[PDB]
């Protein structure tokens, strides 16, 4: 059994700061859980219930680093933290994701790829940030209309950031929708974007999922 405790599946998989421990087992038969949906930053988790089906029984789990914090992001700023995600008393962010923002006042086109050479199915997770107004949008990413494209041999989708005044949730009126896919052995996944990308930092490899 996998012990999550005060955490949930969403918090554990994204690397919610309050779920820093309990990466625990390399295999398990059932998941032990019982928190504002578990997502630090407000948003909509895509196919969350289906993801719980896949992860409820696995045999060869592993958390690895799909895009190192350095080098893998030569341009763009990767230190983004927010009050919503807080470890102890300081601002933080997801352990497995990075908030990409301004670097020297520019947001160059993003294109980075990774080939699953681990002989297992790979679970990659990313996010799409949605600013509340356009001035803040331009303050971070410097593009009025941005795109995020995630493509592999068995997955493809382009994202458009919808910018509108939203009611503050958890002190935040912005949103980050989270999305996940499974990458088959040898398959290649590419992330293309010009803004609003919560870049993947840590991914996962597993079997029976």
């Amino acid at each position, epitope marked *: 059994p996998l012990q999550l405790g005060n955490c949930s599946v969403a918090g554990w998989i994204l690397g919610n700061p309050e779920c820093e421990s309990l990466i625990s087992k390399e295999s398990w038969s059932y998941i032990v859980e019982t928190p504002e949906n578990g997502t630090c930053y407000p948003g909509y988790f895509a196919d969350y219930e289906e993801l719980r089906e896949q992860l409820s029984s696995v045999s060869s789990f592993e958390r690895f680093e799909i895009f190192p914090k350095e080098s893998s992001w030569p341009n763009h*700023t990767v*230190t*983004g*933290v*927010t*009050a919503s995600c807080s470890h102890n008393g300081k*601002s933080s*962010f997801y352990r497995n994701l990075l*908030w990409l*923002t*301004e670097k*020297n*006042g*520019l947001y160059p086109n993003l294109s980075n790829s990774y080939v699953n050479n681990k002989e297992k199915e790979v679970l990659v997770l990313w996010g799409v*940030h*949605h*600013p*509340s*107004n356009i*001035r*803040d*949008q331009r*303050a*971070i990413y*410097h593009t009025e209309n941005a795109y995020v494209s995630v493509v592999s041999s068995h997955y493809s989708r382009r994202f458009t950031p919808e910018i509108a005044k939203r009611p*503050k949730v958890r*002190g*935040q*009126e*912005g949103r980050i929708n989270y999305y996940w896919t499974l990458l088959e052995p040898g398959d290649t996944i590419i992330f293309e974007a010009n803004g609003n990308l919560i870049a993947p930092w840590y991914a996962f490899a597993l079997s029976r999922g």
Partner: antibody, heavy 130, light 109 residues
Framework: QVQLQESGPGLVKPSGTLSLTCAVSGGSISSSNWWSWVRQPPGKGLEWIGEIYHGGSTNYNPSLKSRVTISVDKSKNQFSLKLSSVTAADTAVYYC???????????????????????WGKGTTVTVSG | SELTQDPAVSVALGQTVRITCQGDSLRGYYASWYQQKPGQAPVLVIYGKNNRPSGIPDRFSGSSSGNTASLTITGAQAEDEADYYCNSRDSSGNHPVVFGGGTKLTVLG
């Protein structure tokens, strides 16, 4: 790193137009920085004048909005200030500084809700006399 | 709209002193602090909440409690005799920048 150098007249006739220039070296004017002006009348404190973005967005001090005009010139990597209808109350030491980018709404990380000015010019004294 | 701070305070050598800054704009953005010695341009001593620039002694520390920002100097020394200004951005209108009146720190002893 970025360094700022002020250029301006030591003296400006009353009711005339004050004009200064701030040169940027070690960095690019076309960045997500707010290039700001500040002044300090003799024996008084600091008074924010205004700020400008490389794109052209301007925000002035409400009290000086009518007689102030901050400009930018990418040709020489500079930005400038213009204060018109000057009086003795405008006699002061004027600075140019660089302020960070910020956000109005709660959509951005914490780094965009600071306000500070880290790089300053050395200051230029401007006296208003006939 | 305006930031208000006491004009003058005194502290004995090696002691600690809290310089308080209060204003209805401190809720929107974090407050910065400067140190200005006579005949010199201001120098930034605190970026945000307790983040200092490179070259600023650990004696300088910042905090915030609602619309109240504070600058604390531990082990106060004669090199610290100067003016101190808090600074933040207004959370309304076109978001003007406002300065506090300044505080003259006298180091006794």
């Amino acid at each position: 790193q970025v360094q700022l150098q002020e250029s301006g007249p030591g003296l400006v006739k009353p009711s005339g137009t004050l004009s200064l220039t701030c040169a940027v070296s070690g960095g690019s004017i076309s960045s997500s920085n707010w290039w700001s002006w500040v002044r300090q009348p003799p024996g008084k404190g600091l008074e924010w004048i205004g700020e400008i973005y490389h794109g052209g967005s301007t925000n002035y001090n409400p009290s000086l909005k009518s007689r102030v005009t901050i400009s930018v010139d990418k040709s020489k990597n500079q930005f400038s200030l213009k204060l018109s209808s000057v009086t003795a109350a405008d006699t002061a030491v004027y600075y140019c500084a660089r302020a960070p980018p910020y956000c109005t709404s709660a959509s951005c990380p914490d780094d965009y809700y600071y306000y500070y000015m880290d790089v300053w010019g050395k200051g230029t004294t401007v006296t208003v006399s006939g | 709209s305006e930031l208000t701070q006491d004009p003058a305070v005194s502290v004995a050598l090696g002691q600690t002193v809290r310089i308080t800054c209060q204003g209805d704009s401190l809720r929107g953005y974090y407050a910065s602090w400067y140190q200005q010695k006579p005949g010199q341009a201001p120098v930034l001593v605190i970026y945000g909440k307790n983040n200092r620039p490179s070259g600023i002694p650990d004696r300088f520390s910042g905090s915030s409690s609602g619309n109240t920002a504070s600058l604390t100097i531990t082990g106060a020394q004669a090199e610290d005799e100067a003016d101190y200004y808090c600074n933040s951005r207004d959370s309304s209108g076109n978001h003007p920048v406002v300065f506090g009146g300044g505080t003259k720190l006298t180091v006794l002893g």
